[PDB]
Copies of this chain bind each other. A is one copy, B any other.
Amino acid sequence: KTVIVSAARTPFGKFGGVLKEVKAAELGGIVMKEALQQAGVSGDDVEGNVMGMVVQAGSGQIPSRQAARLAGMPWSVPSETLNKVCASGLRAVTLCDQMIRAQDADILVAGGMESMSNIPYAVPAGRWGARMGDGELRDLMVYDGLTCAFDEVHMAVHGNTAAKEYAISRREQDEWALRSHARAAKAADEGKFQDEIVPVNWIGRKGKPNVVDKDEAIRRDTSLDQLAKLAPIYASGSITAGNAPGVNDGAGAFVLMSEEKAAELGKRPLATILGFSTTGMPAHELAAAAINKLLKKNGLTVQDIDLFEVNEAFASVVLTCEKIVGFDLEKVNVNGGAIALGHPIGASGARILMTLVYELRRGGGLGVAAICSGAAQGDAVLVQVH
C-alpha cells in the first residue's frame, strides 16, 4: 500500500485577490517544496511527480515540471500534468498510488494547483480570422473550467438540477452554506488549519514584501438573512453566489511513499491509503457520486467511517450525497468546505484529503474523501489515519 508522509497546501485566495500576482506554477512549487520539507525528504530522492491543473492555458509548457523545478527537484525527476477537471488534485494522489502499487516507484510527489485569477481570455477566431461581424472574447475559465462540454451549461445548472431531483430546498442549501462558513471561521481561529497551510511569501513589484498566510474567502459576518436574499446565479434555480463557492487561487501537495519505503526510512506517516473509487455518470448527475462503491469493496458501512469530506461544489452536492450515502452530516466537512474556503479547481481535491487527514488530531481513524468533477465523474478515497 501507499502512505501519505506529508501534506501541505497554500492558503486559498479569492479571485483577483491576495494571490493574484502568483502563478499556478508558483503555488505548486511552494507546496511541493514544503511537503518535501515536512517529510524530511530531499528532492533528489523523488521518483516522480503528478500535479493536477484544470485550465492550463497560458501557463506555458508542462506546468507540473515548472512547479517541480521551483520546488527544488532536480531535472532528473519525471513529471506530468493531469486534467480530470475538478477531481484533478485528488486523482493525482490516486494515480501516484497506482504507480507505487505497480512497483515502479517508492517515493512520489502528488498534488494539485490552480490560479483562476490568471487564466487568460481567448480569441477563437484569431488564428483564421473572424472575417465579418462580431466574434467572441472567450473567457477560458468559464469555458474550459466551469462549463459542461455536453449540456453546454454552467456547472451551477447541474447544481440546480440536483436540487430539483433530490428535492433539496433553497433553505437547506442556504443553511449548509452558513455552516460551512461558521465551521471554517471557527476552525481557522482555533488554528486547525495550521497543520495543512504553508504561507506564500514573495517580494512583489516595487520591492513590496507580501505574505499570505491564511484563507481569504471565509465570511464572518454572514447570516441566514443575508444568504436568503441572494438571487439565483445562472437561472432565474436555487443555486446562488452564497451557496456555491466562488473562483479561487490555490495549491496543495503530498509526499507519497510505499509502506515499505516509509518504514525503512523511518518515517511516521500520516495515513495509509486503503483504497479508491471512481465513477462515471451522465453529465447532469454531477451531484451523485462512488463513496458507496468504495465501502462495498472494502466490506464497510457508512457507520464504520469516522469522518467524511465531500467537496462543496454546491451545497446541493453534499446534500444529494446525504440521500445517496446515508451519513450523518455532523460527520461530514466538520470544518467547513469549499463554500467558505473557495474552489481553486485544480487544488480542491488535494485540500479535502489533506484536511480530512489532519482532523482525524482526534488520534483518529477511518476517513473518506470524495469529489465530483465536470462531466459527472466521481472520485473517492478511503484512508486510515494513525
Stretch of A55-63, A199-207, A218-226, A331-339 contacting B (4+ beta carbons < 8 Å): A55-63
Q: How far is the CB of A118 from chain B (nearest CB, A)?
A: 8
Contact string against B for A residues 73-102, beta-carbon threshold 8 Å, 1 for contact and 0 otherwise: 011111111111100000100010111111
Q: How far is the CB of A366 from chain B (nearest CB, A)?
A: 21
Stretch of A179-187, A280-288, A322-330 contacting B (4+ beta carbons < 8 Å): A280-288
Question: Which one of B65, B122, B281, B282 lies within 8 Å of A375 (CB-CB)?
Answer: B65
**What is the size category of the interface that chain A forms with chain B?**
35 or more
In the assembled complex, A374 has its CB within 8 A of some CB on chain B: yes
In the assembled complex, A138 has its CB within 8 A of some CB on chain B: yes
Task: Please report the C-alpha to C-alpha distance between residue A279 and residue B75 in the assembled complex, in whole angstroms.
Answer: 9
Task: Please report the C-alpha to C-alpha distance between residue A61 and residue B138 in the assembled complex, in whole angstroms.
Answer: 14
Determine whether the beta carbon of A124 is less than 8 Å from that of B58: yes
Question: Which one of B58, B97, B142 lies within 8 Å of A134 (CB-CB)?
Answer: B142
Determine whether the beta carbon of B141 is less than 8 Å from that of A132: yes
Task: Please report the C-alpha to C-alpha distance between residue A60 and residue B215 in the assembled complex, in whole angstroms.
Answer: 29
Determine whether the beta carbon of B132 is less than 8 Å from that of A130: no
Stretch of A29-37, A144-152, A307-315 contacting B (4+ beta carbons < 8 Å): A144-152
Q: Name which residue of chain B comes closest to A276, CB basis.
A: B104
Residues of B within 8 A of A100 (CB): 102
- Knowing A101-B102, A375-B62 are in contact, say whether A57-B126 is a contact too (CB < 8 A): no
Question: Which one of B63, B98, B137, B280 lies within 8 Å of A99 (CB-CB)?
Answer: B98
Determine whether the beta carbon of A83 is less than 8 Å from that of B58: no
Q: How far is the CB of A220 from chain B (nearest CB, A)?
A: 24
Report A50-74 residues with CB < 8 Å from chain B CB: 55-66, 69, 74
Determine whether the beta carbon of A126 is less than 8 Å from that of B135: yes
In the assembled complex, A143 has its CB within 8 A of some CB on chain B: yes
Copies of this protein in the complex = 4
Determine whether the beta carbon of B56 is less than 8 Å from that of A83: yes
Q: How far is the CB of A43 from chain B (nearest CB, A)?
A: 11
Q: Name which residue of chain B comes closest to A91, CB basis.
A: B80
Question: Which one of B75, B80, B137 lies within 8 Å of A283 (CB-CB)?
Answer: B75
In the assembled complex, A362 has its CB within 8 A of some CB on chain B: no
Determine whether the beta carbon of A135 is less than 8 Å from that of B129: no
Task: Please report the C-alpha to C-alpha distance between residue A148 and residue B75 in the assembled complex, in whole angstroms.
Answer: 14
Question: Which one of B80, B126, B134, B143 lies within 8 Å of A60 (CB-CB)?
Answer: B143
Determine whether the beta carbon of A130 is less than 8 Å from that of B126: yes
Determine whether the beta carbon of A280 is less than 8 Å from that of B103: no
Determine whether the beta carbon of A282 is less than 8 Å from that of B75: yes
Task: Please report the C-alpha to C-alpha distance between residue A83 and residue B137 in the assembled complex, in whole angstroms.
Answer: 25
Contact string against B for A residues 103-133, beta-carbon threshold 8 Å, 1 for contact and 0 otherwise: 1100000000000010111111111111111
Question: Which one of B60, B126, B139 lies within 8 Å of A147 (CB-CB)?
Answer: B60
Determine whether the beta carbon of A125 is less than 8 Å from that of B132: no
Determine whether the beta carbon of A144 is less than 8 Å from that of B78: no
Interface residues, chain A, with chain B CB atoms under 8 Å away = 15-16, 48, 55-66, 69, 74-85, 91, 95, 97-104, 117, 119-150, 247, 278-283, 285, 373-377
